[PDB]
Amino acid sequence: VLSEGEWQLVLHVWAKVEADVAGHGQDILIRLFKSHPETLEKFDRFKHLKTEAEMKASEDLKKHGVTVLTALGAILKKKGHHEAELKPLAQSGATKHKIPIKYLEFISEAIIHVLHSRHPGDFGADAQGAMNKALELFRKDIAAKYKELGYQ
Ligand code: HEM
């Protein structure tokens, strides 16, 4: 669990993301693929994207980014109470896409990195700490649900 003040910090930084989901999503995804290209193979859709510049120019990729961030944000706003929200995602990653927890750890890394590149002033040791926990809480919940469905 997280304290109330930790959630406030998560939520306080989330509001900044909210002023530019599209812009934040793209950085996040680019970062992820760039640092861990093997994750790129899960996306047949994006696989042909050769450079950054081209990643950046892709409408598809940017629309995907907003989707990813939108679901995430909905989860965080629940401060722990997100089973309803979370379930569809575990179901699909266990059953359809097969995304390993490890991949979820790399994406959390990319998130942290972006938030810090964009909002250093609202992203200190204390917030960063809080965000980490929040993302770890999601990953742990996901992990359990995955197992209940038969997927590592
Ligand atoms: C914060 C973590 C993430 C969130 C909230 C998230 C959310 C979503 C959402 C909401 C969708 C659309 C519906 C669905 O297919 O279930 C999706 C699709 C997908 N996700 Fe993620 N995702 C996350 C991380 C990842 C990671 C780390 C990977 C692995 C490399 C991944 C691979 C995919 C793929 C391949 C699809 C199919 C999308 C498409 O083809 O339209 N996702 N994700």
Curated annotation (Swiss-Prot):
Record annotation: effect of changing G121A: In metmyoglobin
Amino acids binding O2: H64
A GO CC term attached to the entry: sarcoplasm
Record InterPro entries: Globin (IPR000971), Globin-like_sf (IPR009050), Myoglobin (IPR002335)
Residues annotated with Phosphoserine modification: S3
Catalyzed chemical reaction(s): Fe(III)-heme b-[protein] + nitric oxide + H2O = Fe(II)-heme b-[protein] + nitrite + 2 H(+); H2O2 + AH2 = A + 2 H2O
Binding positions (nitrite): H64
Principal cellular location given in the protein's record: cytoplasm
Globin domain boundaries: 1-147
PTM sites of type Phosphothreonine: T67
Keyword Oxidoreductase: yes
Keywords associated with the record: Cytoplasm, Heme, Iron, Metal-binding, Muscle protein, Oxidoreductase, Oxygen transport, Phosphoprotein, Transport
Positions of heme b binding: G93
Keyword Coiled coil: no
PANTHER family associated with the record: MYOGLOBIN
Name under which the protein is recorded: Myoglobin
Species: Physeter macrocephalus
Classification of source organism: Eukaryota, Metazoa, Chordata, Craniata, Vertebrata
Gene: MB
